[PDB]
Design a protein around this ligand. Structure first.
Ligand SMILES: NC(=O)c1ccc[n+]([C@@H]2O[C@H](COP(=O)([O-])OP(=O)(O)OC[C@H]3O[C@@H](n4cnc5c(N)ncnc54)[C@H](O)[C@@H]3O)[C@@H](O)[C@H]2O)c1
Ligand SMILES: NC(=O)c1ccc[n+]([C@@H]2O[C@H](COP(=O)([O-])OP(=O)(O)OC[C@H]3O[C@@H](n4cnc5c(N)ncnc54)[C@H](O)[C@@H]3O)[C@@H](O)[C@H]2O)c1
Ligand SMILES: O=Cc1ccc(Oc2ccc3c(c2)COB3O)cc1
Ligand SMILES: O=Cc1ccc(Oc2ccc3c(c2)COB3O)cc1
Lengths: 484, 484
């Protein structure tokens, strides 16, 4: 118990070769079949919500309610959306035609691609393996899924339960870390969706080139939060939204607030408002125990039993504790090694060249930098990689529009964080080293489909026949010259 | 004269670094600037149409009227379309929202990506270097272009003329073959558009992974033509369209008729109709000379002065002459080595395992296979790579729809060939080993742009705040349970 079986290398081609045949044999082509399968994955989630929450707790130490909001309900809404709008999404589109081809009958049809690979990640292990899967299967593909090994209990359970609802020839499973994942990537797929680090994204895309496979890459970077000096009266909402977005999963969220850029005059009030938000959300007893101002008979036991989630492993814990040395610990600072607990920490007087402000934090550390004018914002943000998310807290329509226009990022949100990702009708995806492609809803269906142009002509005379057919007469030249 | 100067490896980073700065300095951001630049490229083409036709003749031995129809006028129409619809295309789109986020203000903005690399190919050297370029610049990118070295005169002239209209810091030039092109691909770009072979596409995409650069890959394969037994009365139109599509560029066109699949009873009538179409288009004197039934004082001279185009080099000539040994020469067969002339040839009694029916022909050889029923069509077509183009000649609504549904290809055309590629309002691109991504018009602008979601919220209470913020109370659990 605890982990899934590492898939044998001999079986990895067998698993992909079976899904190939399935796709080829029309296993998931017809709309009746796609809806059954999308319904069976709704049952998987709805009937075992309890067990999944318990599994995701053992891996992440997330609370059931945190998990319900962040994973369970977004996956229910995705299944609902895709069944409701499938008949809309399959149907051909009449493009607007211009010039000669406007006399013809033209059409954009959507057709499946074939076998899709989903490679997943540990921080939201169900959501980030199944939400891609729903989209692939909604578009008439068959699929192979590779769960993160850094959430073994969630990989174990899903491996246990998924084949009771959906057959392995329709949705295949491969478990393991680097070796098992390198073997699968040697196999031919028609689209790969990958979530993870840019470093590993380069190796996937290198694998994808072997077979010319289109990739959708869901990556990270340092999502900035810009706070201006028009939010004074709302500072408690600004603080609670930014602190919520960081507290969730102990910061280990790709769209979380990575650092803040605050207008020089609003620094003190934001920081203090973040500290009160923090205290409200983590609760008094918890922070006293972590700090050591209150003793408990079984300290390790108590932290493992808390509402606050853990860091994934010892290496990322230590990395995050060394980032504290890149500034002044204004708020927080508290950690415990044996339960991989690091409470949210706000750092001031940042050396902007320190690793904490060069690499993605992906943890509870939140640096706070200031800006006197808009151009100091732009040299901070645009000197770095294009981030997955950009956040602006402001009531000024000029200041918001000016920051949008002058920066590039996966998404912008004005006056909140994170929630755009759950929003029905927006694509979710990066740009530059935050990624390429997008998915969710219509955009997963569009991503996992080939848009196929179809032109219908008759056998009768039309404009084009005056100039196309050789021989190239002098009369044909004088007609074409007259156009130029 | 003849060729451009091979770009020095020391200058290749300098050239890309200059376009980077340009993009970064807003060289092509504002709409006034993009339209000037698109107008200056209209002037480039319009004012030097003559010289380009002469250059493209020396490389391809294509007639000025062939070139005007296939390259000059499609590039004029593209410039036209992009200036006319730019103000449409820049504008944000209001996606349809559902659930919670429908209370907010949501938006899809389009923003430039940065520096775009266009790698070109020899067979339509101007069209397939500039049409990508127009789309990149219409989307607010700056650009680097790499002309095929297998059309040196067209590369020379464009290198001569392009910087007189548009500055090198806005549109950079790199000339050379394998070495120069490997050096450029070591540099960072924000999108690559490549036209060429799937073999070399894999090496480009491998380069693109180094920097996580999104690729649009414009490739080939064997575009089938399916002829049924409902076209008897129209056989002269069917034959002249298929023979036109092959005659152009001596077959060296990625969307040309590669082979035919004819219903068993219509074989003789199609083949003979293709032979009469061939004779009509290439003219009697030409074919007699080529065959040797009519002599001329300077044979080599006469063929170099003809309207029929040449094979790119000796290697592809010999390859195409060995394909004649994969069947019976029903129509044609005639060749001359010193002018790299191979007249269109129809082969019957094909060994379907012979290289002529395994690899892309890209030449004047046209195999003809038969089918008794629809499933014989499907095992021919679907046993091979997904092709760029699929063509169906038919008047039966059931037979057409059945072939569309059961095959995958870059585009379908019913009752013609090639022209879909010039059609305003369809995307042009492949699928599988015919390619990924699409361009032309709106679709080039969409390809060379990041679609950026933007969510705007207010600071007041809303649906989401009932469940998101910790601490995780029992009252918060009972609210979330009631939803499940
Ligand atoms: N935008 C999103 O949807 C999203 C969501 C979650 C996380 N992320 C990003 O993920 C990033 C990194 O998380 P991580 O570093 O724990 O990811 P990771 O290292 O766990 O990688 C993810 C997947 O890649 C596989 N992998 C690891 N090394 C490999 C190799 N050498 N070859 C092949 N496969 C390999 C793993 O098995 C795993 O399934 C974060 O920085 C975050 O920003 C993005
Ligand atoms: N769909 C389309 O738009 C389209 C249009 C024209 C041609 N094509 C296809 O492209 C192919 C054209 O033939 P081709 O094979 O002569 O193209 P090609 O081999 O000349 O490749 C195109 C470009 O790649 C470069 N190149 C060649 N080898 C390289 C290497 N090792 N590293 C880096 N760069 C390299 C060349 O300099 C050239 O500019 C055909 O198969 C045809 O079907 C497709
Ligand atoms: O790390 C990346 C990531 C991406 C998407 C996530 O899914 C959410 C779905 C719905 C909602 C939220 C989040 C927050 O509020 B929602 O309504 C969570 C994490
Ligand atoms: O081999 C690949 C390829 C790709 C695109 C081509 O450009 C065309 C543009 C416009 C038109 C056509 C063709 C035919 O009629 B048109 O008006 C030609 C060849």
């Amino acid at each position: 118990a605890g982990v899934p079986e590492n898939t044998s290398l001999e079986n990895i081609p067998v698993i992909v070769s079976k899904c190939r045949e399935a796709f080829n044999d029309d296993a998931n082509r017809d709309l009746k079949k796609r809806k059954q399968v999308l319904r069976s994955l709704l049952n998987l989630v709805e009937e075992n919500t309890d067990e999944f929450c318990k599994a995701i707790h053992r891996d992440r130490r997330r609370h059931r309610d945190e998990t319900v909001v962040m994973e369970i309900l977004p996956l229910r809404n995705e299944v609902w959306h895709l069944i409701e709008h499938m008949d809309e999404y399959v149907k051909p589109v009449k493009p607007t035609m211009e010039g000669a081809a406007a006399l013809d009958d033209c059409e954009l049809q959507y057709e499946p691609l074939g076998v899709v690979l989903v490679i997943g990640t540990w921080n939201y292990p169900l959501l980030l393996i199944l939400q891609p899967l729903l989209g692939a299967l909604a578009a008439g593909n068959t699929a192979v899924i590779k769960p993160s090994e850094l959430a073994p209990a969630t990989a174990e359970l899903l491996t246990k339960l998924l084949p009771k609802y959906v057959s392995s020839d329709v949705v295949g499973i491969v478990n393991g870390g680097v070796s098992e994942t390198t073997a699968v990537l040697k196999e031919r797929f028609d689209h790969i969706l990958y979530t993870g680090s840019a470093r590993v994204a380069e190796i996937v895309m290198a694998a994808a080139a072997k077979h010319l496979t289109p990739v959708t890459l869901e990556l990270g970077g340092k999502s900035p939060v810009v706070v201006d000096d028009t939010c004074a009266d709302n500072m408690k909402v600004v603080a609670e939204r930014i602190m919520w977005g960081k507290i969730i999963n102990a910061g280990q969220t790709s769209i979380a607030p990575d650092y803040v850029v605050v207008e020089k005059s609003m620094e003190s009030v934001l920081v203090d408002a973040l500290a009160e938000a923090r205290k409200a959300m983590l609760g008094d007893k918890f922070l006293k125990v972590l700090k050591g101002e209150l003793l408990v008979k079984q300290k390790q036991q108590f932290l493992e039993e808390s509402d606050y989630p853990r860091i994934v492993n010892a290496s990322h814990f230590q990395r995050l504790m060394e980032f504290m040395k890149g500034g002044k610990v204004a708020v927080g600072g508290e950690a415990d090694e044996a339960t991989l607990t690091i409470a949210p920490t706000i750092l001031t007087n940042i050396d902007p060249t320190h690793p904490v402000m060069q690499e993605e934090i992906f943890g509870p550390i939140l640096p706070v930098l200031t800006y006197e004018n808009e151009k100091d914002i732009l040299k901070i943000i645009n000197s770095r990689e294009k981030p997955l998310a950009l956040y602006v807290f402001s009531n000024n329509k000029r200041f918001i529009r000016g920051v949008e226009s002058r920066t590039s990022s996966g998404a912008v949100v004005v006056n909140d964080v994170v929630v755009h990702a759950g929003a029905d009708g927006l694509p979710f995806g990066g740009v530059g080293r935050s990624g390429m492609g997008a998915y969710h809803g219509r955009y997963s269906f569009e991503t996992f489909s080939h848009r196929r142009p179809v032109m219908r002509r008759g056998f009768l005379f039309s404009s084009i026949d005056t100039v196309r057919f050789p021989p190239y007469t002098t009369a044909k030249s004088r007609v074409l010259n007259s156009l130029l």
